[PDB]
Symmetry: D2
C-alpha cells in the first residue's frame, strides 16, 4: 500500500540509501534513471530497476534513515551522545522536553522519536535561519505534531512548567540552571552538552551554587570504536572520532 | 494522589535512593526508621522524616531507578551498551522486538521502556531460574503488559513474524542469523552483543554467508569516561569500565 | 660470577619476583625458607630450592625489576607516561636532565636508566623525607653515580646551564618556565606532567607569554589497555587505568 | 664549530623543520633561498636569513628530528608503540637487540638511539629494497656503527646468542618463538607488534606451547590523545589515531 507522496528509502546494489518522496517523476542516479511512479501500489521489500537494469530495493524510512540523510549545519549532537542523554536521563515515551538551541534539529529528531506522538519537545532557537532548517527537517521526518520551535532566547526564561527534562546544547548552559530548576518537575533531569572542559567547570560552579535544587551532577564523555572485521584480520578501525562533547546530568530535587 | 501499593523512590540527605512499595509498614534505614503510611495521601516532591529526624524526599520512580535498583545476576547488558543498541538500530515506540537470553532482565527493561505500552518484547530464555528473576523484575518495573518471557531455546527457531529487531546477548548469535533473516521485516535490525573478539569473528563469517539477506554489518564498542569536576581540579576519573562487549548490527534486505 | 652483596631476582614457580641482596642469610617465603648463600658462585639462569623443595630461578635485575619493586609513596609517574616523555622529547644516552620534584624516584630511575652512566639527572625536592626515600631507591638501583638529589625549591631557580631537558611533576610547572628557558640549550625540551586540566590551562597561558622562547607546545595523555588472551576468548581487560596525567612538551628556540 | 658536511635542523618562522646537510649550496624554500655556506663557522642557536629576509634558526639534530623526517614506506612502528616496547621490556643503554623485519628502519632508529654507541641492533629483512631504504636512513641518522642489516629470513633461525631482546614486527611472530627462546639470555624479552587480534591469538597459542621457556605473556595496546589548548577552550582533538597494533611481551625463563 505505497501511495503517491509517501516517503521511501531506496537501497543501491552497493547498499547506498536514497530517502525519497514518491511522485510521478524521474530520479537521477549514479546507476541510471529511476521511474518513481513504479513504486506506487508496491510493497516494502520489493524493488524497482533503473533504465540500466540496476536494482533498487524499497524500505520504509526509519529514524536511522531520517537522521542519516537530514540536511545539517557543521555542529550537531552525534547519535552516540543523544543515545547516552536518553539512557542516563531515562528519557521515555510520553515525556515533555524543553531543549535549546534547536540547531539543525539532529538532537531534536532523536528525542522526538523517543518521546513518541504523545510526548512533546519544545526547542528554543535564536537564529531564524537554523530554526527554519530544523523545522524543515522535522516536518520532513514526520514529527511536526510533537515538536514546536520557538524563536526565543532561553537565557531569558523557560515558559514551560512540570517538564521532564531540560536538554541543552548552548554556549552557556550555566545561564539556564535557575530557569530549569523552576521548570523541572521533582526528579526531572537537567542535561547539558559542552565541547570544552572550560564549559564543564563553569557549569559545575553554577550547579554547586544550586546544590539545594539538584542531586550530585555527573559529567561523562562517550567514545565509540568501529571494528574492521575481515576473514583474516579483526582490528579496530585506525582512526576514530574521539571527542565531541562532555555531557552533564543533574537530577532535580 | 499517592495511594497504598504505589511505588516511590525515597531520597536520603546523602542522595541515596530507596525504591519502595508504599504500605503501612516500618522501613529500617542507615538513618533511622521510616513510617511508610505517612507517604499515603502525599505528593511527589514532598518529604517524610525518620524517627531520628532525617528527611527522605519522595520521587516518582523512573526507568533510571528501576534499572539501578533491579535484582541482578553477574552478567547484564550495561546501559551504555543498551543505549547504543537503541540508537544505531533506531529502536522506537511501538516496535516489536525478539530478544534472547532474558538474563536478569536489564536489557529487557531498557528496551521495554523505549518501545512503550504499545510495543512488544518477546524474550527467550533456557534457564528457568533466570526466567523467574527477570519476570519478577519486569512485573516490579510495571512492564508485564508488554514483555513476554518464553522458556524456549532460540537456536531452535523464532516463532514471531514481521519483527522490527532481533536483539541477542547469547554465546552463539551465529546460530540465530538464519532464524532472524526469516523473522525480521525488510529494514529490520539484527543486533548481537558479544564480549569476545572470537564471537565477533564467528558471527561475521555467518553474516557473510547470509550476505544476500543483510546489508553490510557494523561492529562497535563503546567506552564512557566519568569526569571528576572539583573547584580546583577537573580530570577524568582514574579508573574506568573499558570493556563489556562488542555490538554488531546488520540490517535486513 | 655471582658474588656476596650482589643483587639478584628470584622467580617463583608462580612467576613472582623477589629482588634480593645476596648474603649468608635465610629468606622467608610463601613457599618455604631459602638459603641465600647457595646463590654465591652460581650463574644467572640457574636455580635454588626452598627447604620444601620449591624452585626459585635466578635472574640478573633489570630496570623493569627495580621499577616494579621500588619503595614508593602514593603519587608516582607511571612507566607509560615516562615512556612517552622519553619518546616525544627524544631523551637519549648522555643527556643532562633537570627534574623536579624527585618524589619516590620512579621517574628519576626511569630517566637515569635511559641517559646511561655518562648522562646526568639532577632532581630538586622540597620534602626531605621524599628526598631520602628517593635517594635510597636510587642507591639500591645502582644509579647514585649519575643522579644527584638537591634539597631546594626549583621555583627559586635552576642553577644548571646547557641542559638537554627540564622535566617536571610539580603542582605549578608554570613557575618554572622562565628558569627553564634560561637553563635549556637551543632545541632542548621543557616537559611537564599534570593530573588536572586546570594545570594544563595555566601552563599553556605561561608558555604563550614565553612564545618567543619555545616552539608551539603539545599536550597529550596516554592510555594503555591490557588484553586478556585465553584459548577460547580474547578481549580487553574489563577495567583500566584511564587517567594519570597530561603531558606537555615545548621545545626551546 | 658547525663545519661543512655536518647535519643541521633549520627552523622556519612558522616552526617548520628542515633537516639538512651543510654544504656550499643553495637551498630552495617556501620562504626564499638559503645560502647554506653561511651556516659554516656558526653555532647552534644562531640563525640564517633567506634572500627574502625570513629567518631560519639553527638547531643540532636530535633523534626526534631524524624520526620525524625519515624517508618511510606505508607501514612503520609509531613512536608511541616503540616507547612502550622500550618501557615494558626495559630496553637500556648497551643492550644487544635482534629485530625483524627492518622495514623503513623507524623502530630500528628508535632502538639504536636507546641502546647507545656500545649497544647493538641486528635487523633481519627479506625485501632488498626495504633493506636499502632502512640502511640509507640509518647511515643518515648516524647509527651505522651500531646497527647491522642482514638480508635473511628470520623464520629460518637467529644466529645471535645471549641477546637481550628479540623484537618483531613480522606477519607471523609465532614462527620465531622457538628461535628466540634459544637466542635470548635468561630474563631477556621477546616482544612482538601485530596489527590484528588474529595474530595475537596465534602468537599466544605458540607461547603457551613454550610455557616452560617464558613467563606469562602480556599483550597491550596504546592510545595517545592530543589536547587542543586555547585561551578559551581546552578539549581533546576531535579525531585520533586509535589503533596501530597490539604489543606482546614474554620474558625468557
Ligand atoms: N540562548 C540561546 N537560546 C536559544 N538558542 C540558542 C541560545 N544560544 C545559542 N543558541 C543556539 O544553539 C545552537 C547550538 S548548535 C545545536 C545543535 C543541535 N543540538 C543539533 O543536534 O542539531 C545554535 O543554533 C544557536 O543559535
Ligand atoms: N539458545 C538460547 N536461547 C535462549 N536463551 C539463551 C540461549 N543461550 C543462552 N541463553 C541465555 O542467555 C543469557 C545470557 S546473559 C543475558 C543478560 C541480559 N542481556 C541482561 O541484560 O540482563 C543467559 O541467561 C542464558 O541462560
Ligand atoms: N617547588 C618545588 N621544588 C622541588 N620539588 C617540589 C616542588 N614542589 C613540589 N615538589 C615535590 O614534587 C613532588 C611531586 S610527586 C613526584 C613523583 C615523581 N615524579 C615519581 O615518579 O616518583 C613531591 O615530592 C613534592 O614534594
Ligand atoms: N620472515 C621475515 N624475516 C625478515 N623480515 C621479514 C620477514 N617477514 C616479513 N619481513 C619484513 O618485515 C617488515 C614488516 S614492516 C616493519 C616496519 C618497521 N618495524 C619500521 O618501523 O619501519 C617488512 O619489511 C617485511 O619485508
Amino acid at each position: 500500500m505505497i501511495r503517491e507522496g509517501d516517503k521511501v528509502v531506496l537501497v543501491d546494489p552497493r547498499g547506498k540509501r536514497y530517502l525519497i518522496t514518491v511522485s510521478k517523476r524521474d530520479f537521477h542516479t549514479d546507476l541510471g534513471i529511476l521511474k518513481l511512479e513504479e513504486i506506487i501500489g508496491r510493497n516494502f521489500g520489493e524493488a524497482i530497476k533503473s533504465h540500466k537494469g540496476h536494482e533498487f530495493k524499497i524500505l520504509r524510512p526509519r529514524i536511522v534513515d531520517y537522521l542519516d540523510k537530514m540536511k545539517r549545519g557543521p555542529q550537531i549532537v552525534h547519535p552516540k551522545d543523544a543515545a547516552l542523554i536518553v539512557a542516563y536521563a531515562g528519557i521515555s515515551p510520553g515525556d515533555f522536553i524543553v531543549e535549546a538551541g534547536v540547531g539543525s534539529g539532529a538532537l531534536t529528531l532523536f528525542l522526538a522519536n523517543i518521546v513518541g506522538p504523545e510526548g512533546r519537545v519544545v526547542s528554543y532557537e535564536i537564529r531564524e535561519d537554523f530554526a527554519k532548517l530544523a523545522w524543515e527537517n522535522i516536518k520532513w521526518a514526520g514529527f511536526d505534531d510533537r515538536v514546536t520551535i520557538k524563536l526565543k532566547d532561553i537565557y531569558e526564561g523557560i515558559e514551560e512548567e512540570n517538564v521532564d527534562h531540560v536538554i541543552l546544547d548552548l554556549p552557556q548552559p550555566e545561564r539556564v540552571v535557575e530557569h530549569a530548576a523552576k521548570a523541572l518537575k521533582p526528579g526531572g533531569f537537567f542535561v547539558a552538552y559542552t565541547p570544552c572542559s572550560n564549559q564543564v567547570m563553569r557549569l559545575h560552579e553554577k550547579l554547586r551554587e544550586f546544590k539545594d535544587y539538584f542531586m550530585k551532577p555527573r559529567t561523562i564523555n562517550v567514545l565509540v570504536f568501529d571494528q574492521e572485521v575481515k576473514k583474516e584480520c579483526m582490528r579496530p578501525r585506525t582512526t576514530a572520532l574521539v571527542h565531541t562533547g562532555y555531557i552533564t546530568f543533574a537530577r532535580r530535587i
